[PDB]
A paper describes a structure:
In Vaccinia virus (VACV), copies of the double-jelly-roll protein D13 bind to the viral membrane via interaction with its partner protein A17 and assemble into a scaffold surrounding the viral membrane. This process leads to the formation of a spherical immature virion (IV). The 62-kDa D13 protein exists as trimers both in vivo and in vitro, and structures of the recombinantly expressed D13 trimer have been determined by X-ray crystallography. D13 adopts a double-jelly-roll structure composed of 8 antiparallel β-strands.
We purified recombinant D13 trimer protein for structure determination using single-particle cryo-electron microscopy (cryo-EM). Initial attempts were hampered by problems associated with preferred particle orientation and spontaneous protein assembly into honeycomb-like crystalline patches that consist of rings of five or six trimers. This problem was mitigated using holey EM grids coated with a graphene oxide support film, and the cryo-EM structure of the D13 trimer was determined at 2.3 Å resolution. The refined atomic model based on this structure was largely identical to previously reported crystal structures (average RMSD 0.495 Å). However, the presence of the short N-terminal tail α-helix (aa 1-10) was inconsistent with previously reported models. Our cryo-EM map showed intact N-terminal tail α-helices in all three subunits, with or without imposition of 3-fold symmetry, although reduced local map resolution and the increased B-factor suggested that the helix was prone to dislocation. In our structure, the hydrophobic face of the N-terminal helix (M1, I5, I6 and L9) was held in a pocket of surrounding hydrophobic residues from the adjacent subunits. Additional hydrogen bonds were identified between the side chains of T4, N2, Q35 and the carboxylic groups of V451, L452, and N2. The protein solution turned turbid after dialysis into low-salt buffer, but examination by transmission electron microscopy (TEM) showed aggregated honeycomb-like patches and rodlets without any IV-like particles. We found that the N-terminal short tail α-helix of D13 is critical for in vitro assembly into ordered structures. We propose that repositioning of the N-terminal tail α-helix away from D13 toward the surface of the lipid bilayer may act as a molecular trigger that initiates scaffold assembly in vivo.
Numbering used by the authors:
A (entry chain A), B (entry chain B), C (entry chain C): 0 to 10, 15 to 45, 49 to 547
């Protein structure tokens, strides 16, 4: 029922038809899902190799790696890192008889896939995998066997068949190097990690979409291979040499925990919000913070200053006042507040970082049935950095105090965490430790910034939530155009990308000041793909 | 402020202009939102017919069906299934004078729209609709009147005006067949469903975007019509005949509850996470699991083994130990543990499935004001399958035990659930009951897999979270190319798609072993659309 | 490993190659992120001006505005509105020597960006910014300094370099007008807003992506400039004159709070779900609703009817029964129910809106340590409208009752909220106050609807969750085609868009009946962009 207004509004010119189109008949082809088994060899890293050789496979894309995780038994606490499938991959390489066609580091693969929620979920992200489970007997099953699937995104996936890797009758080999299983496991000290590690085995299977094409017409294309460079420990510089045609440049920082035992007080498991991290940390602290006891509590170091709560409920810790109210406290028992649970300082009369001063209100109810306090509303100022401080840093040699005044029961619940893709200096990469960034191409300054406007642009343009500081040089559509690059001038000397940052200033009495940092620079170089005598790539100069 | 580096980096060749384009003048047209009322007729299913006849409507797409849900009154418990608007649709057909142009089943329509969160939300997904409400008097209003909107996605929507259905001066009729209202309602036994069902009436209105086009130039196009085949009860096979040009093939399993009363213990209402299902189930179980009583609890079957909790809090149920601690228990009362609340077994001395053994720690506080236990931390191993077991299966004839030892008050809270789009054998389609899948085209094997790598690929390629095992044959862009299909060879005999699965093995002492299953195969056939003497389609061969 | 079925299925015709493409070499260019500082001037609104003048910048797009929010100190309660960065912008204008090239209102900018979660998050959406913080001393830091980033989406962003604004050697000026800081702040009366407002200063920096293009070839393009018209207070009409080529028309309603003090009882801060709003409101009400007291509670107006709860727990308020059970009540104390906490009525014996009657079950436990009630399960019927009623409306002159019988402590916790982008008559724009909508073009009726099917279509087509009633006239692809518009017929008189709504009927005894409403109509006009003697636009007629 069109209105008279509508039928009279339209009341000559060459007009493009937007209500019809001629359907082009495409190249004749037939796709097939193909699964292959690999040969494992053993740095002694595990390495899986897959050989693709079939005259009827003309092209392929969409590599998926499946992994069988085994049943885990015994006692102790044990979970998997989130996205375990991606955290397992150290390196991936695709190569033909002519050499390497494409390759990537596992962290860069994860960074490229981090905006793909479906892929992250298939990589193994669930409560059954990522909760920290407990075994009570040597026969208790901590984790049941399960299979995860890792989508190995390549440049060959962007335009479906248009960008797919053509096999010009050559053999194609895919090689997957794995990280050691310690990287993907979160465990306490009571778990028999030596036995688990001696018995653990990666079991991979490779899948891809193959294309049988009739009368294929191959043309040369353009591919981008990421290349990574890691700076020295705590140095504010890193240089990428032999840069002749780069499409983009990425910069970020990784913490280095090699000077520690890799032990942390808490970990939220499947829950991965900042609030979840903080809630897990606070839950671990409260068991030692407020104590209901018949007499002064026992089982703490001599350095512990445990103080009885007065009738008004306020315990003053220097300038800080902590409000403590516990219901149903027995008559033969008092309420005590640990006033220096964790403390750090560099001089005997300077500023002290004291975790007890971060709490302002603690309320809960005591349970006579379970002999413990069930906490309710907690008012505190604990941030993600406190949850990210390694346990070794509290008891460092630079600390003029004891450091860790927790009970032995609390110290036995600390977890080993060797997650290989941690960015920044906290688990969420929230704190921005870069205050200034300068990028040089040759001797001349290419780009400078103070605030993270390059990260803001990276996130806006890629529609990601976990972006980094990225200089993007290509804004042209993929595949159909040759990508735009910054191009070297060897005569002028402009053929390397030097990066210099200024790190943010931290308090020398904050434990986080001593986490070691490395600067990571990623450069995407442009390559040309040719299909004469097999598959070949050349670096564009 | 361009840097000298930038202005000297660019320091001939035919270059495509990527900073400008000539704006093509499109076909002259004017869109209008048009709403129509239908004629209802009454298998006795309701059927709504809408006639589109207007010489000035040249094309249309984007069908939306609105439905007025009436005010629900009375007593009992009552909610709507999530996405009630889509759950209401049994069948949709679009046809002209020449015959059916396009049609789909309601479940396939839901499957095609499941990745559209906006559409699912408009279909009716809110707490006011999907919470299980309670009426206390015969005049209490359980649900207020509300309107839902169902987006009926067709092939005519993919490329906006390019793919829109052209009305070549013909009459177009849309016919909507509805499911019976029992399918979309979740109620207990105290709700007067007979009266509600006698008085309920579907009230639909149809909307679409029409296009008045001046001097339209129509061309023939290609359309895909899904076709479904349902296998026999508990058979591992299903065949699709007359397959001459298919773009894709989908496979999944549906549970068949016809051998039951369709009653379930719990349902989470608006909350639809797996954890929400499990929490609702546990909340229903705890009211009978742990009892605070003055003397041995009364009101349970003679088969119930209710045991007093010792002072240490551990009750051993065969090999399983349950820890029970309840605060504030009165002095004249004890704490009791129901040790066989639900139990299933096939032999008198074999394995027993016992829901009481799935709990390891139960803590809470008794309330003297409300005479009930408020539970706190619960440690258990309840999975989604337990929440999906029908109540009839516990009391089956094959069970050598009583089965359901709950109280009458608990049994009166069970809910009828007839949701028509359930997949798998649980409400979340999480358990994978297919262990092996083989697809044959003619006599030859087209595809085999063990793990669900085809489902992994379906989800990756369609960016969905609720994918199925799907063989996709078309990777060419829609509309602008003729779609790629697997093509029949009638000379060779290759003209049907046979499907055979191997179902996963289950424990004969698990109640879920006896849920009946059907195999569903969906085949998308390619059709050609022509515009001579009205609108016509032909099957491509 | 291709199957024999696959290799025999494919066993002439001009076929388009879908496995290769010739890579076109694009225009030579180099992008750069450029940041500028502005000149501030002071309706006395702050205004930031940025001058872009550089012969080597050929084109630009992707404007980002950063803002430094200062440290907030003192006592009282203080937070920022969600998306503070967007809420700060009153107006944005881009202009060259020829005049205004493009401009938009801040509310329309927010509406265009509301589907961009990344952009909304960068605008300032976090607990640290949006929680309502408390200062206790005149030196307590309520908020730490932080920087937000506002993505100013323009038409120049849709097709990357294709749609970018060309600077034809002209100077380009960007002007940002800011809202007063009262609009972006949520505070109580104890916060020193006069001092904060005297000292607050907007500190903006502008960024954009510039393009140095070698041998650019510029062509004329088409741009759409939104234009807004606001109807008179409580009038159901609004007209847009001089409409000669419009691509779309939007309609919605804004509440007008100028007849109030802009004070509300509660606000959920960072949590922005409807349930969060309702939970914050209920949490504020419960502290006065149920009172544990030694004797009749004191500190309430003489109009307050506070009633002791009987032993059965049921207090009847006219036809409504409230169930109140509180555990651990001391022996020298009773439980009391405030039965007319908030009440509104227009006649002394007609219907009364009473907030106490909206509660059906209240349970909790009294705390002897903190002298307050910790509530548990609450059964109520509080909706978002109750949470959106302004405090002034309860104590209106039309109310024949007192209105607000809360304690002084509760009244001191009310918050000032001047959020400038509120739609509808509640904070979530959930209630639909438009029952019928008629759009006229000239004298003839262009479109009519009752239900919000135009909003349903707006949301479906734009993939948004916060759509409005929108008539869309353009369904052609952006940039590459000249947009489709409704076109004026000045001879016939069709050159204005008149809008008339019928507002929904409300109860004259509901306080929400008296919130004043304005009708907002937005019309997107089509303009042509030319590049002779700088940058110029002309209105298409």
């Amino acid at each position: 029922a069109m209105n008279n207004t509508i039928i009279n509004s339209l009341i000559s010119i060459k007009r493009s038809n937007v209500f019809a189109v001629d359907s082009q008949i495409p190249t004749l082809y037939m796709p097939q899902y193909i699964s292959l088994s690999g040969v494992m060899t053993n740095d002694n890293q595990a390495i899986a190799s897959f050989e693709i050789r079939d005259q009827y496979i003309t092209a392929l894309n969409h590599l998926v790696l499946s992994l069988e995780l085994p049943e885990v038994k015994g006692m102790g606490r044990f979970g998997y890192v989130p996205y375990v499938g991606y955290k397992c991959i150290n390196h991936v390489s695709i190569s033909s008889c002519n050499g390497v066609i494409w390759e990537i580091e596992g962290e860069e693969l994860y960074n490229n896939c981090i905006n793909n929620t479906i892929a992250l979920k298939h990589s193994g992200y669930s409560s059954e995998l990522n909760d920290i489970s407990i075994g009570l007997t040597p026969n208790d099953t901590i984790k049941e066997p399960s299979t995860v699937y890792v989508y190995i995104k390549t440049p060959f996936d962007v335009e479906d068949t248009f960008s797919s890797l053509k096999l010009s009758d050559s053999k194609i080999t895919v090689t997957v190097t794995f990280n050691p299983v310690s990287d993907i496991v979160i465990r306490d000290s009571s778990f028999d990690f030596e036995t688990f590690n001696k018995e653990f085995v990666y079991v991979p299977e490779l899948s891809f979409i193959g294309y049988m094409v009739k009368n294929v017409q191959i043309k040369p294309s353009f591919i981008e291979k990421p290349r990574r460079v890691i700076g020295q420990i705590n140095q504010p510089t890193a240089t990428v040499t032999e840069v002749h045609a780069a499409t983009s440049l990425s910069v970020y920082t990784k913490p280095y925990y090699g000077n520690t035992d890799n032990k942390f007080i808490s970990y939220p498991g499947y829950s991965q919000d900042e609030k979840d991290y903080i809630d897990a940390y606070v839950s671990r602290l409260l068991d030692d913070l407020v104590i209901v006891s018949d007499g002064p509590p026992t089982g703490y170091p001599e350095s512990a200053e445990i103080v009885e709560v007065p009738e008004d409920g306020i315990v003053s810790i220097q300038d800080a006042d902590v409000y403590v109210k516990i219901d149903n406290v027995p008559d033969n028992m008092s309420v005590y507040l640990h006033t220096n649970l964790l403390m750090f300082g560099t001089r005997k009369n300077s500023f002290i970082y004291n975790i007890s001063k971060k709490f302002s209100a603690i309320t809960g109810t005591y349970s006579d049935a379970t002999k413990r306090t069930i906490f309710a509303h907690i008012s505190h100022s604990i941030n993600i950095i406190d949850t990210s401080i390694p346990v070794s840093l509290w008891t460092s040699q630079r600390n003029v105090y004891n450091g860790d005044n927790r009970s032995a029961e609390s110290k036995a619940k600390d977890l080993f965490i060797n997650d290989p893709f941690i960015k920044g200096i906290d688990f969420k990469n929230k704190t921005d430790i870069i205050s200034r960034l300068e990028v040089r191409f040759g001797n001349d300054v290419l780009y400078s910034e103070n605030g993270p406007i390059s990260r803001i642009y990276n996130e806006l343009l890629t529609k990601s939530n976990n972006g980094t500081r990225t200089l993007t040089f290509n804004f042209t559509p993929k595949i159909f155009f040759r990508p735009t690059t910054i191009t070297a001038n060897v005569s002028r000397g402009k053929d390397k990308l030097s990066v210099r940052v200024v790190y943010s200033t931290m308090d020398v009495n904050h434990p986080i000041y001593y986490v070691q940092k490395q600067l990571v620079v990623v450069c995407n170089d442009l390559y040309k793909v040719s299909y004469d005598q097999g598959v070949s790539i050349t670096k564009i100069m």
